[PDB]
Design a protein around this ligand. Structure first.
Ligand SMILES: CCc1cc(=O)nc2[nH]c(C(=O)c3ccccc3)cn12
Lengths: 117, 117, 114
């Protein structure tokens, strides 16, 4: 899985330990091994939410499976909680786009995750 | 809705009020309220279009509904118009990827927009 | 088509010619003229792969068609090869998301490709 956060919160406000916390908490939430979790944090961005430049975040989570109604609401609670606690971003100024990726459409290690045919 | 612009145009060439203008124009175009519109502009990018590093932009528009053949042609005219006028980027050096998002696949405010089941 | 690379490799480590090599190799690989290909390289990123911040990359390739099982495995070999050779990133620390775009959902030059 891969999780990206783009935010106008300054780099200096991203706490030590943040990428590792995301890595471990997403491993737990998705049931996938930590070794396969990638995280990407992009501070200092020029962005607005609702026309306001108060702290906000635009995020993406890509996973092969483990994407769906109840699961995505769970991820949102988890990830909004982290963004609120660590970056002081209000949950109602966060968007997270969820993508259920087909194994054939994710490349890795010179191939993809579709090895069957 | 979420609109992202990545461009090699320098930061100083992005006019003040560009984010607000995008916000207003997108609210009008999509019929969604401004409070739900998120905009994100990323200047000074290392990019090429057709092998040239002249001004260009790679963009995305994510919306729950209001995405389709006719509407997208209309968005492209609107957004290329703004990028050309404000950032001086030629319309034939812009790509915009449109995404019709399922409500269940967009997280916000500790949950998603799938609140029904 | 368009290709985006996000990496924690520093900008100074991105070699002269890299964007051009991606453009022409992707032209060859997708069969499209180089004039169609957009590439975007984002160095110096704050990222981790498997909990480690050794060199890694998160990438996307969007194309109207030319996306599929065998084709994507070919793109991955090509692109991982380039990232390993040029940016010294291990292939097992690269993800590439492939998107088969509908022509109606790609805007260009005041319109779409539909
Ligand atoms: C055709 C003019 C054209 C001009 C470009 O500068 N870029 C580009 N990309 C495509 C493309 O990938 C495509 C378009 C329609 C169907 C299949 C692929 C087509 N173009």
């Amino acid at each position: 899985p891969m999780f990206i956060v783009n935010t106008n919160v300054p780099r200096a406000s991203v706490p030590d330990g943040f990428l590792s916390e995301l890595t471990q908490q997403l491993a737990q939430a998705t049931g996938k091994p930590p070794q396969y979790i990638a995280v990407h944090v992009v501070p200092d961005q020029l962005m607005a939410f609702g026309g306001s430049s108060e702290p906000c975040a635009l995020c993406s989570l890509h996973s092969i499976g483990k994407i769906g109604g109840a699961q995505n609401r769970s991820y949102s609670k988890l990830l909004c909680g982290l963004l609120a606690e660590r970056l002081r971003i209000s949950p109602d100024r966060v968007y997270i786009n969820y993508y259920d990726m087909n194994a054939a459409n994710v490349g890795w290690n010179n191939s993809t995750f579709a090895l069957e045919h």
